[PDB]
């Protein structure tokens, strides 16, 4: 493709791939919160049990 | 900056960003991010012999 045409197709690929990374990170932050809570419970049980 | 030259009618399409050809490649090349205006007119009455 000629530059001005390629730029359109490339822009779509960059947006899609960057958006995919954003989705991945968001899900990891949410999962991290769940694991942190579990770790805190485990730490409490170690101390009290 | 005003760049002046004479070419054939069929070569007029080469005076543009992203284009290739024996004018675009060996005589007068514009950058892909070219900013400016291209003006052309038929000079057959003056230049042809």
From Swiss-Prot, chain A:
It comes from Severe acute respiratory syndrome coronavirus 2 (2019-nCoV). This is Spike protein S2'. Subunit of the fusion protein that is processed upon entry into the host cell. Mediates fusion of the virion and cellular membranes by functioning as a class I viral fusion protein. Contains a viral fusion peptide that is unmasked after S2 cleavage. This cleavage can occur at the cell membrane by host TMPRSS2 or during endocytosis by host CSTL. In either case, this triggers an extensive and irreversible conformational change that leads to fusion of the viral envelope with the cellular cytoplasmic membrane, releasing viral genomic RNA into the host cell cytoplasm.
Curated annotation (Swiss-Prot), chain B:
The chain holds residues 396 to 444 of 1273 of the full protein. Binds to host ACE2. RBD also interacts with the N-linked glycan on 'Asn-90' of ACE2. Cleavage of S generates a polybasic C-terminal sequence on S1 that binds to host Neuropilin-1 (NRP1) and Neuropilin-2 (NRP2) receptors. Interacts with host integrin alpha-5/beta-1 (ITGA5:ITGB1) and with ACE2 in complex with integrin alpha-5/beta-1 (ITGA5:ITGB1). May interact via cytoplasmic c-terminus with M protein. May interact (via N-terminus) with host bilirubin and biliverdin, thereby preventing antibody binding to the SARS-CoV-2 spike NTD via an allosteric mechanism. This is Spike protein S1. Attaches the virion to the cell membrane by interacting with host receptor, initiating the infection. The major receptor is host ACE2. When S2/S2' has been cleaved, binding to the receptor triggers direct fusion at the cell membrane. When S2/S2' has not been cleaved, binding to the receptor results in internalization of the virus by endocytosis using host TFRC and GRM2 and leading to fusion of the virion membrane with the host endosomal membrane. Alternatively, may use NRP1/NRP2 and integrin as entry receptors. Residues 8-10 are annotated as: Integrin-binding motif. The lineage of its organism: Viruses, Riboviria, Orthornavirae, Pisuviricota, Pisoniviricetes. Changing residue 13 to S: In strain: Omicron/BA.2, Omicron/BA.2.12.1, Omicron/BA.2.75, Omicron/BA.4, Omicron/BA.5, Omicron/BQ.1.1, Omicron/XBB.1.5, Omicron/EG.5.1. It comes from Severe acute respiratory syndrome coronavirus 2. Changing residue 49 to T: In strain: Omicron/BQ.1.1.
């Amino acid at each position: 493709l000629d530059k001005p045409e390629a730029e359109v197709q490339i822009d779509r690929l960059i947006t899609g791939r960057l958006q995919s990374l954003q989705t991945y990170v968001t899900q990891q932050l949410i999962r991290a919160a769940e694991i942190r809570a579990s770790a805190n419970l485990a730490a409490t049980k170690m101390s009290e049990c | 900056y005003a760049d002046s030259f004479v070419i054939r009618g069929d070569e007029v399409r080469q005076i543009a960003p992203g284009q290739t050809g024996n004018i675009a490649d060996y005589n007068y090349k514009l950058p892909d991010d070219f900013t400016g205006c291209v003006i052309a007119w038929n000079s057959n009455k003056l230049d042809s012999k």
